[PDB]
Chains A and B, each alone.
Chain A
Amino acid sequence: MERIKELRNLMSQSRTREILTKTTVDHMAIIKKYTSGRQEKNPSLRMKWMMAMKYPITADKRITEMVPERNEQGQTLWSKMRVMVSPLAVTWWNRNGPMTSTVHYPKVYKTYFEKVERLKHGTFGPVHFRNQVKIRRRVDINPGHADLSAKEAQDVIMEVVFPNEVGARILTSESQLTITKEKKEELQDCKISPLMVAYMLERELVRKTRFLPVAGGTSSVYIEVLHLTQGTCWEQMYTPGGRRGFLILGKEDRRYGPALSINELSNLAKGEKANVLIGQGDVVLVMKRKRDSSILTDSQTATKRIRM
């Protein structure tokens, strides 16, 4: 309601109108970077000045019926002119407030939770003072996941986090990676944040390497403790310790009814064809498969048609 009304009056002004009309989706990221280039007016001093005044934080309406206006001492926690609140409200919430189960946290931040387990189950040796030479090679800071490349990691992330906004590939193949099943089953009712979950999943699932001047261990577990192991003239020894087949026929037809969403293709029929919205705006006509259409040796059998 609000978004469509805000879009309506944006069409009244022409200067924005050809911007909307002449810009394809693929060029959106080109537009997004025309914002600004000058903001750093001594941020530390600004923060110090803002922390001196009362009500420096912004919050939503509902905090009015979850936190009292005054505490036992007699100090105001929020004021009416989003509403303005003070850090005393945050401390009060940390002291008195509703409690919820935190069972999903270890399953999302597990890549951080493995580091402490590695560290506190460790032992140290002696330190040696000498001179040494450090060489360079490719080092893996994120090990990633085996049996998974960079192409399908993004596919898994999109399938798990944004099931309704996938299109073309992942929608026409006839398969299902195993890890997707467990990832969907475990996060059945996780309500932390889509973006945070996506970022953590990419961090713990996608591998990436860099260049470092390391003169010690090469494995990934020896990289995050590089600041503790090496030095200018000293060396410390340490051990870690421890979705069916679909094909598109064309664009939307006006004789086949309104288009439907990805999650509403489950019902379908035994061969009906219908319009569907896929990707970031595409609308195509699809209809399921009466055969296999696989990638087996048949593709090579075309060699029988040549070189007789």
Chain B
Amino acid sequence: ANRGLWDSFRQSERGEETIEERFEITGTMRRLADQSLPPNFSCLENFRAYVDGFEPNGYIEGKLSQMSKEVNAKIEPFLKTTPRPIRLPDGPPCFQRSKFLLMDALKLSIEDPSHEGEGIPLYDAIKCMRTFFGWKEPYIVKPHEKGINPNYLLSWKQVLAELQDIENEEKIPRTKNMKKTSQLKWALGENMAPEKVDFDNCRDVSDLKQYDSDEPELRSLSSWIQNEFNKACELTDSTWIELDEIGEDVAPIEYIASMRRNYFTAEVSHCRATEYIMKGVYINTALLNASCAAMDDFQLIPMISKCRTKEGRRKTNLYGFIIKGRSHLRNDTDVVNFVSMEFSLTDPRLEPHKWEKYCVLEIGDMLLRSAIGQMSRPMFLYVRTNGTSKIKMKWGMEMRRCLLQSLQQIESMIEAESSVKEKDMTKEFFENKSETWPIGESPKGVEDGSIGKVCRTLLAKSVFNSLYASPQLEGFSAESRKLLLVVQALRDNLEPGTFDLEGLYEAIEECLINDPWVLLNASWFNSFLTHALR
């Protein structure tokens, strides 16, 4: 009984005989099995008898001999003049749709808080705010063309007033709950909730549509996403990341891995993409905590980041404010609304089309210490209404994996190159200064760069892939991978060939509806194609 044989042995004595098993159809299963056969049979037993006495004489060849010749797979050659550029859609220009603006942001530094200072973010934001003088009367500079702008003005004024009116309290609070005002209620959309009733009472009503089943609009490509990508690959004066330590190394392979990762960490430590990752992680974590804590209050959430200065002083930076609505989340798909306000110095009247879902206010003047003297520039506030998800908060909290992916890509290239020249290639890649990689373009032609530049480019690409997820990206990536593999096979003198080159193309254009990132990727692919065979 221990090994698992007692049950069958016990259930095998039918009087004074031994029977192995028993199983019969005997009923409705028989009738059901009766019409689960090819059309030229009626009983299962006859089909079994026919199958048992089967011998293959000539069936396959005989069937093949009488099939029409239009069923075929003909190969057409792939030459150097075969491929054609991909067609991009045309229409009105696209607009920014990111959660927080990237290139047009400033910070209000706290200037090296004490080493023992660990407090609530609200007090840090207040101390950052008290360091600025130059507020003026705010006024609208760019209407939203869909909504009410005085509501935005009143919201900003209420934020200022309720931040200033803390002192009228006998006890100092920990978090701030905003008063439910008409403009705030309109901004958070608390009065635009449809009512639900059974279909029986409202069967006779008119003007009823299925749902928002409308064909998506078509938009073209602008020149600001390329500028954002260009700016995202530059170096800063801060650190933005500090990793912990591990044990000492003994084996030579440990030394090789250590030098590889040390070079990689040194090259991409001061990049802007790390700042974006930290900003996103902090904002998403704070918003998730606030949403999970308070469910029936309008809480004020600051945008705060931390870094280390060049000489070695910790610094805290404030970006803006977020006001959250009502959050009663039962599943992972329910949406919570909020409104975001951010500071900037960029005049919106240079690219009005870029900002289409924003309201822009002028709020003050800023003194610049660059060169000698002091010059004043206007200060602007961008206000927008949004609401993301519960899942996407978790999606935004994991952005440290992009560094891991970039390191994996670099190490994969190093290993692939070292596998052919059977020796160690970690030295010829990093410390060699006469090697250049083509990762650029200009009216002159193709430019060149160093290893740190390509590492930062890969990190920025991973970050932007994380920040602009969409199925169009997946489809375009797959089809472009297939096309690139075909092109590379062509370049190796291997005589490639295809069966249907068009359908791949129409797939490529049908995965090219609206996303500016995918349009930029398609333009990059076209620019690669125009040079790969010339």
Residues on the B chain within 8 Å of A233, using CB: 415, 418-419
- By beta carbon, the residue of chain B nearest A52 is B289
B252: Cβ under 8 A from any A Cβ: yes
Contact across chains for A129 and B253 when beta carbons are under 8 A apart:
no
Residues on the B chain within 8 Å of A228, using CB: 251, 253
Shortest CB-to-CB span from A158 to chain B, Å, is 12
Shortest CB-to-CB span from B397 to chain A, Å, is 9
Q: Which of A207-246 contact B (CB under 8 A)?
A: 228, 231-234, 236
Alpha-carbon distance A42/B395, docked complex (angstroms): 13
Contact across chains for A129 and B424 when beta carbons are under 8 A apart:
yes
- By beta carbon, the residue of chain B nearest A233 is B419
CB within 8 A of A124: which of B251, B418, B419, B423? B251
B25: Cβ under 8 A from any A Cβ: no
A188: Cβ under 8 A from any B Cβ: no
> Per-position contact with A for B134-162: 1 when CB-CB < 8 Å, else 0?
00000000000000000000000000000
Residues on the A chain within 8 Å of B422, using CB: 129-131
Alpha-carbon distance A130/B415, docked complex (angstroms): 11
Contact across chains for A131 and B253 when beta carbons are under 8 A apart:
no
Residues on the A chain within 8 Å of B424, using CB: 129
Known: A26-B1, A124-B251, A233-B419. 19 other contacts (CB 8 A): A26-B6, A42-B394, A49-B292, A124-B252, A127-B252, A127-B256, A129-B418, A129-B424, A131-B419, A131-B422, A228-B251, A228-B253, A231-B253, A232-B419, A233-B418, A234-B253, A236-B251, A236-B252, A236-B253
B49: Cβ under 8 A from any A Cβ: no
What are 19 A-B pairs with beta-carbon distances under 8 A? A26-B1, A26-B6, A42-B394, A124-B250, A124-B251, A124-B252, A126-B252, A127-B252, A127-B253, A129-B422, A131-B422, A228-B253, A232-B415, A233-B415, A233-B418, A233-B419, A234-B253, A236-B251, A236-B252
A-B CB proximity, top 8 nearest: A233-B419, A130-B422, A127-B252, A129-B422, A129-B423, A124-B251, A236-B253, A127-B253
Residues on the A chain within 8 Å of B251, using CB: 124, 228, 236
- By beta carbon, the residue of chain B nearest A130 is B422
Residues on the B chain within 8 Å of A232, using CB: 415, 419
Q: Which of B239-255 contact A (CB under 8 A)?
A: 250-253
Shortest CB-to-CB span from B252 to chain A, Å, is 5
> Per-position contact with A for B414-435: 1 when CB-CB < 8 Å, else 0?
0100110011100000000000
Alpha-carbon distance A49/B251, docked complex (angstroms): 40
Shortest CB-to-CB span from A281 to chain B, Å, is 14
Decide if the interface of chain B is mainly helix, strand, loop or mixed. helix
Residues on the A chain within 8 Å of B1, using CB: 26
Alpha-carbon distance A124/B418, docked complex (angstroms): 22
Alpha-carbon distance A124/B250, docked complex (angstroms): 9
Shortest CB-to-CB span from B311 to chain A, Å, is 34
> Per-position contact with B for A125-147: 1 when CB-CB < 8 Å, else 0?
01101110000000000000000
Q: Which of A98-137 contact B (CB under 8 A)?
A: 124, 126-127, 129-131
Residues on the A chain within 8 Å of B423, using CB: 129
Residues on the B chain within 8 Å of A131, using CB: 419, 422
Residues on the B chain within 8 Å of A127, using CB: 252-253, 256
Shortest CB-to-CB span from A30 to chain B, Å, is 11
> Per-position contact with A for B4-24: 1 when CB-CB < 8 Å, else 0?
001000000000000000000
- By beta carbon, the residue of chain B nearest A124 is B251
Alpha-carbon distance A231/B411, docked complex (angstroms): 13
Residues on the A chain within 8 Å of B250, using CB: 124
Which of B1, B253, B418 has the most chain A CB within a 10 Å cutoff? B253
Residues on the A chain within 8 Å of B252, using CB: 124, 126-127, 236
Residues on the B chain within 8 Å of A129, using CB: 418-419, 422-424
Residues on the B chain within 8 Å of A130, using CB: 422
Residues on the A chain within 8 Å of B253, using CB: 127, 228, 231, 234, 236
Alpha-carbon distance A233/B411, docked complex (angstroms): 12
Alpha-carbon distance A129/B414, docked complex (angstroms): 12
- By beta carbon, the residue of chain A nearest B288 is A45
Shortest CB-to-CB span from B476 to chain A, Å, is 30
Q: Which of B370-421 contact A (CB under 8 A)?
A: 394, 415, 418-419
Q: Which of B250-306 contact A (CB under 8 A)?
A: 250-253, 256, 292
Residues on the B chain within 8 Å of A234, using CB: 253
- By beta carbon, the residue of chain B nearest A125 is B252
Residues on the B chain within 8 Å of A42, using CB: 394
> Per-position contact with B for A36-72: 1 when CB-CB < 8 Å, else 0?
0000001000000100000000000000000000000
Alpha-carbon distance A124/B251, docked complex (angstroms): 7
Residues on the A chain within 8 Å of B292, using CB: 49
Shortest CB-to-CB span from B318 to chain A, Å, is 24
Alpha-carbon distance A134/B527, docked complex (angstroms): 42
Alpha-carbon distance A126/B252, docked complex (angstroms): 8
Shortest CB-to-CB span from B250 to chain A, Å, is 7
- By beta carbon, the residue of chain B nearest A154 is B2
Residues on the A chain within 8 Å of B418, using CB: 129, 233
Alpha-carbon distance A232/B257, docked complex (angstroms): 14
Alpha-carbon distance A126/B256, docked complex (angstroms): 12
Shortest CB-to-CB span from B354 to chain A, Å, is 36
Alpha-carbon distance A51/B6, docked complex (angstroms): 50
Residues on the B chain within 8 Å of A49, using CB: 292
- By beta carbon, the residue of chain A nearest B256 is A127
Shortest CB-to-CB span from A49 to chain B, Å, is 8
Alpha-carbon distance A49/B292, docked complex (angstroms): 10
Residues on the A chain within 8 Å of B394, using CB: 42
Alpha-carbon distance A307/B1, docked complex (angstroms): 36
Shortest CB-to-CB span from A151 to chain B, Å, is 10
Alpha-carbon distance A129/B422, docked complex (angstroms): 5
Alpha-carbon distance A130/B421, docked complex (angstroms): 9
Shortest CB-to-CB span from B289 to chain A, Å, is 9
> Per-position contact with A for B290-329: 1 when CB-CB < 8 Å, else 0?
0010000000000000000000000000000000000000
Alpha-carbon distance A124/B254, docked complex (angstroms): 12
Q: Which of A228-267 contact B (CB under 8 A)?
A: 228, 231-234, 236
Alpha-carbon distance A228/B423, docked complex (angstroms): 19
- By beta carbon, the residue of chain B nearest A238 is B251
Alpha-carbon distance A130/B6, docked complex (angstroms): 55
- By beta carbon, the residue of chain A nearest B397 is A45
Shortest CB-to-CB span from B267 to chain A, Å, is 23
Alpha-carbon distance A42/B292, docked complex (angstroms): 14
Alpha-carbon distance A127/B254, docked complex (angstroms): 11
Residues on the B chain within 8 Å of A231, using CB: 253
> Per-position contact with A for B470-503: 1 when CB-CB < 8 Å, else 0?
0000000000000000000000000000000000
Alpha-carbon distance A131/B421, docked complex (angstroms): 11
Alpha-carbon distance A236/B424, docked complex (angstroms): 13
Shortest CB-to-CB span from B172 to chain A, Å, is 21
Q: Which of B205-243 contact A (CB under 8 A)?
A: none
Alpha-carbon distance A129/B416, docked complex (angstroms): 12
- By beta carbon, the residue of chain B nearest A228 is B251
Shortest CB-to-CB span from B418 to chain A, Å, is 6
Shortest CB-to-CB span from B528 to chain A, Å, is 28
Alpha-carbon distance A295/B1, docked complex (angstroms): 24
